[PDB]
Amino acid sequence: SHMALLFTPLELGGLRLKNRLAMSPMCQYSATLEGEVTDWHLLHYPTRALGGVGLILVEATAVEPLGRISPYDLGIWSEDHLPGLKELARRIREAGAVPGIQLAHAGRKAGTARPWEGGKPLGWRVVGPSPIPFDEGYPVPEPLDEAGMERILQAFVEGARRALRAGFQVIELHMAHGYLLSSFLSPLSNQRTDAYGGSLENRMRFPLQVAQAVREVVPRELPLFVRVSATDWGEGGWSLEDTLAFARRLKELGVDLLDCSSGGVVLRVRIPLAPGFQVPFADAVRKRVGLRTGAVGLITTPEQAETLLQAGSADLVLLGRVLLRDPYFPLRAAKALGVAPEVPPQYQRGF
Amino acid sequence: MALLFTPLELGGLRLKNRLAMSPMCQYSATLEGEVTDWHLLHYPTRALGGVGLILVEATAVEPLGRISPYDLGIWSEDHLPGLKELARRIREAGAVPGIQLAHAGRKAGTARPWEGGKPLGWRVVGPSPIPFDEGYPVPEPLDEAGMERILQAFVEGARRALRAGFQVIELHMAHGYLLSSFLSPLSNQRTDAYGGSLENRMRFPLQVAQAVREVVPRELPLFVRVSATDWGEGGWSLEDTLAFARRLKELGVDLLDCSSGGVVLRVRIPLAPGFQVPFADAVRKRVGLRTGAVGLITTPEQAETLLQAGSADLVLLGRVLLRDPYFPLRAAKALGVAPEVPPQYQRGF
Amino acid sequence: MALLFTPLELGGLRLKNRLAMSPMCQYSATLEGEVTDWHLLHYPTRALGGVGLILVEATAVEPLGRISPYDLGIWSEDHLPGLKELARRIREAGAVPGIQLAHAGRKAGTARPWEGGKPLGWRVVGPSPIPFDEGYPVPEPLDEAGMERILQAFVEGARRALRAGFQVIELHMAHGYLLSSFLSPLSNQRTDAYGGSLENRMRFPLQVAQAVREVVPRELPLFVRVSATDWGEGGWSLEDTLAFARRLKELGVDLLDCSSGGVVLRVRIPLAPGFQVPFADAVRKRVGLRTGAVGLITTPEQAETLLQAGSADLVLLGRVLLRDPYFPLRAAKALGVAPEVPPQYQRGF
C-alpha cells in the first residue's frame, strides 16, 4: 500500500485532475424534447462528482436536433441550452469533479426510442456516409453531401465552443458505436464512391476534418478527447491496426487523448466480453502510437483500474455501469488502496 | 468468456487455466530438506483451489544454497521420495506440479521469519565479496570452477525434479540470491570476466540457464524468475532484463516470471496492485517471450485484465493463496465460469 | 472488539473463537466407513482456516444407519485408527475436533448426491412405516428390543468417539433422520408408548440423549442438532422444540444446534440469510439452553451480529467453508481482530 497511481493527479492540457478516474458518458434519456438539461441530470451527475471521479464526461449531447440518439438526449445546438448546461457544469465542478462533455452525432442510428420504452426507430430523416440501414427497422440513411457534412462539421465546432462557454473544460467527440463519425470509419457502413470512401485515407477524412475544426476552437489548456470504436469486430471492417493509423493522425492534429471503445457499427457481430476486454486497444494505441489513452469496458475494481495504469496500458480509467450502481465507488476505491480519499466534511465520519 | 480460465499451451503441456501459485517458502522442511506433512496439506489444498499450476517453493540445489535450515532441498537423491509424493498428490487435486530450483547466494543461511530471520554465519558464496547487509557473512567470490560446480547442482537438481514428476522447472534468478546477485551490479562489482559488463554479469546466469535447459525436454517448459529491477539507481534496470530475456528466449526458456527487488534492502519500491505487471508487459511485447505476472494480484477482474491487455500469458498468485487457498474456484464463478469444484464441494457453490 | 473471536467456554474446554464447522457429509469413506485421505485433507484444511471447532460429518453408529455406503462409521473398533488420526490431524491445525453421531433412519441407504442420490433399497428402520417419500424404502417400525440396540449404538459411538480424541459429540436428531423422524409426527404415527403424545414421541430421543450424556464426561460438552421445525403442517412446531429443549437442558445437554426441515420434502422453507437463527434465538432466551446458529451464515458482520444480539453462543458454518476454508481467518482481520494465523502465512496477512 506504499502507492496508488489511480489516485495520483493526471495532467492533461492545462489542468490537473485529482485522480485518474473519469465517468464514461452515459445517456440518461431524461432531457426535454428540445434537449434542455432537466432536474434528473442535476442530481445524477453532481452525485457522481461527489463520488470522487476526477472527471465527469456527461452523456452524448447532439450537435444537431436530428443527430440525437433519442428524442430526450441532451442538446448543444441552440444557445438556449447554455442555462441548463452552464448550471450542470457548475454543480459538477462544485462537487469536486472537472466537468467535461461528449459531442456526438448519431448518424444512421439516430432517432431511437428510449431503451426502456422500446428502443425502436421513430422514423427520422437520419444521415450517414452511405445509404445502408443500421439494421432492419431503421430508416434508410441519407448519404451526406459536403454541404451537409460542413453543417455537421460546423455543428461540432459551434457545439464545442458552446460547451466551453458553459464551463465544460473537456470535450470528447463521439466517433464510435456506429454513430455518424464511426459510420464513416468502418467499411461495414461506408461504401461511398467519393473522396470520403473507398481508401482508408478517404474514409478517415471527414472524421479527421471534424477533429481539426474542433481542435482550433478549443484552447490548448483544455484537452480534446475522442472516443472511437477501436474495432467493429466484423471482418472486412475497422481493425485494431487501422485504429493505430487513425490514432496516429489524431495525435498529430493535437488531440490530447483517446477513449478506446469498440463495437456498435453493426449488430450481427460477436464481442469478446470480459473484464478489461477493451484494454488491449488502449494499450496498443498508447505504446505503439504514443497518444494518451483512456481505458473503458467492465472496469469495476480498484485493483483492476490501478493495475492497467501501473502496466502503462492507459493514463485514465473511465467507469460506466459501475457508477450507475455505485456512484461513490471512487471514494471507497481510494480507501481500498490505502489512500485517504478527500471526502466532503459532512461524510468524513463515514470513512 | 474469460481468458483467465482458458487453457494455456506452454512447451508441450496444457494448463486447465492461466492461474498459477507463485513459489513461496514455508520454512517447514526438514533439517535435511525433506518434504514434511505441512507441504502435503499446504500445496494440495491450493491445487484443489483450482490453480492450473502449482509452483513449489524455492528448493535449494545445495545445502549452502538454502535460505533457512528448514528449506526444501533437491541436492540428494534421498529427497526424491518426499518430493515425488508431494508432486504426486499435487496432481491428485488437479494442478500441474512445478518446482523452483534456487541458490540463496549471499543471502543464504538466515533464520526463519518468526525465529528472527537473522544470518547464521554460513560460508555463503556470491559474485563479489560484499555482505548483503550488516550482519551477513561476507560472501566468498566464486571461481570459474566454483560456479561450474553450482551449475551441475542446478542441472542434476533439475534432472531430479523430472524424475519426481515435476513437469515445470523454474530457475530462481531474482531477489538478490546467487544468480540474481550475478546480474545486478549493486552486488556484483567483479573485476574479472564475470562482472562489470551486462554480458559478464549475464554469463554465469545464462550458463546455468542453458545447462539446465539441455536436460529439460522441449515439451516441459523451463521458467525463469528474475528481479526485473534492483530499484536502486545504477542497478539492474528493466532494459537489462529486456536483454536478458532476449538471450534467455534464444536459449529455449519458454517463459519468464518477472519479479523485482531483493538485491538490497536500502531502496524504495513503487508498491501497488500489479506494480510488477509493467515488467511482464514490457518483456512479453518487446521481446516476444511468454511472461508471468506476479505482485499483488488479488482480484479476478484484474488478473483477467492484464491477460486481456497482453501484459502476460500466466498470472501468478502469492499471498492471496495463503489467506484464500480456494480463491481460483470462487474467482471463476465471479467471472461467469463454471467453477471446477470437487463433487464433494459442488453443493457449496 | 469482536466477540465472534472471543473465547467460548463450554463444559470444561475453551475454543479459540465462536466459529464452528457444521457437519457436512463428504460421502468419501470406505464401504466399511473408514477415514480416507480425503477427510485427512478436507478437515485439516479448515482447521488451519481458523474455526475454533470442527464438527465432522455425520458418522453412522450402525452400518444401515448410514446415509450413503461411503459415510463415516463408528460401529467397529477398526475405525479408531482413521478416526484418531483425523482428530489428531484437526487438533494440530488449531481447531478442536468434534464429531456428529447419527442414524439416518428411514432416509438411510441413499446413493451419493452426485451419483443420483436415489435409494438403494436397504432395510432401513424408523418409528412408523412411512416412506420419507415415494421411491424410498418404507422404514420398518422398531421394537423396544430393537430400539435398545440403536440406543446402545449411540452410546457406543460416543464412548468410541472419546477414545479417538473428539472432545465434543453432537447427536444428530434433525433433518428427518432416525431420531428426527421420531420427533416430527409427519413420520411418527406409532401406537405404542413412543408415539402420539409429544412426551411419547420425545421419549426415545431423550433416552438416547440421556444415555450418551452418561458416557460423556462433564468437561466435554454434549451437543444436539435438532430440526427446530419441519415446515410441515401438523408437525413439529416452534414451541414443541422449546419443550423438547427444556427437557434436554435438564438432561445435561450443554448446547443445541438448531437447523430445520428434512422430515418431509413436500414443504415450504423461507430461504434467507440466517433464516434459522430465530430458532436458535428462541431456545437461548426462553429455555436457557445454549444454542448454535446455522443457516446461510456467510459474512463476518452477520455472525458477530447474531452473537451480539444474543441469539446464539456458537455460529456454525456450512457451505461457506466448502468454498472458503480459511474464511474465519480473513473474517477476524475484516473485523479489526488480529487472527492467530500459522507462522508460515503471517506474511500473507
Place this chain on the structure above:
Amino acid sequence: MALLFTPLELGGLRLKNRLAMSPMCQYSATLEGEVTDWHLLHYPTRALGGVGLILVEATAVEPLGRISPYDLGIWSEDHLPGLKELARRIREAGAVPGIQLAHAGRKAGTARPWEGGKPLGWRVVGPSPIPFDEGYPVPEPLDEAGMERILQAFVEGARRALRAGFQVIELHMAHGYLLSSFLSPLSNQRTDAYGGSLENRMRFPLQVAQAVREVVPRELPLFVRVSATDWGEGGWSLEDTLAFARRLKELGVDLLDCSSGGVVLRVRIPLAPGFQVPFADAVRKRVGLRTGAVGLITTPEQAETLLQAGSADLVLLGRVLLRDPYFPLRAAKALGVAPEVPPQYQRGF
C-alpha cells in the same frame, strides 16, 4: 577471543571451531560392518558436545582390512544406509561428519580389546613377510595387482563415504596398519620399488592419496593420518614425515593428522601432554601443510596455546571425549566464549 573457537575454513567448509573428535574404534559394528545403534548414539552425543568436526572411527575398505570383525565397513553398499543415518545424526547435532578409511594390514583380524585382543589368523596383508609380533599371522607381501586392489578399494570407499554425506574423509596411514607399514622400514623390508628407500616406502601410500584425491572434490578436505615417527631405532623419523608431508601437500591433500607409534610394540614412547604436537608443529612450519594436533590434549587452555603458537590448525580430541563428550561446550565457557549450546541446555550453562 580464543582461537580454539574461531571458525576454521578448510576446503569449502567452515567448522564452528577448531575442535574435532579423533577417530576411535568402538568395535561395536555388526559382523557385516554395518552401523549399529551404539554408533548412532555415541557419535551424535559428542557432536552435540560442540566439536566442530566428528571423524568417525577407522572404517575398513576390505573385510580383511578390518581390525576386528566388528569394525565399521564401507566395502559393500549395504553399509550406506547405516552410514548415511550416522552422518546425518552427526550433522543434526551440529558437527560436520567425517570418516576415516583404513586398512589394518598385518594387524588385521584381532579380537576386541575387552575380549582378549588376540589375533584370529586371517590372511592379513602387508609389505614384507614379517609378523607384527609373535602370535600374529605372518603377512603375505602384496603384488602391484594386490596393492592396486586396495588402492581402488580405498578410492571407492571415499566415493562411497562422500555419497553418504561425510564431508571430510581421512586416510589412515598411521599406527602400523597397512599403509603405515609400507612407510616404516621396521615393517617394510621389501626388495622391489615399494620398500627400502623412503620414496619407495612412500610410493604405494602416495598412490592411494593421489587416487583418493582425484575422486574427492576440492571443497571437501582430504585428511591423512600418519605415524609421524615409529619411535623405533633407524626407522620412520620426523624428518621422514616432513618429506612424506611435502609430497602429499602437492597431491592436494588439505591437512595432515600427526600420530606416532604402532608400527611395532617393543618400543618406548615419550608419554606426555601434547608429546606428538612437535610433529604437527614441525610439519606446519617446515612444509607448509596444515596440521592436526592430537595426543593427551585434555584442557581448554592447552589447546588454545598450541593453536596460538601456530603448532596446528585443528585440535583433535580422543580419550577426552569418551569420558567428557560435552568437554568442548564447557571449554568455551572456560575461555570466556559463549558456546552455542542446544536451547534445551542453555540454562545449564
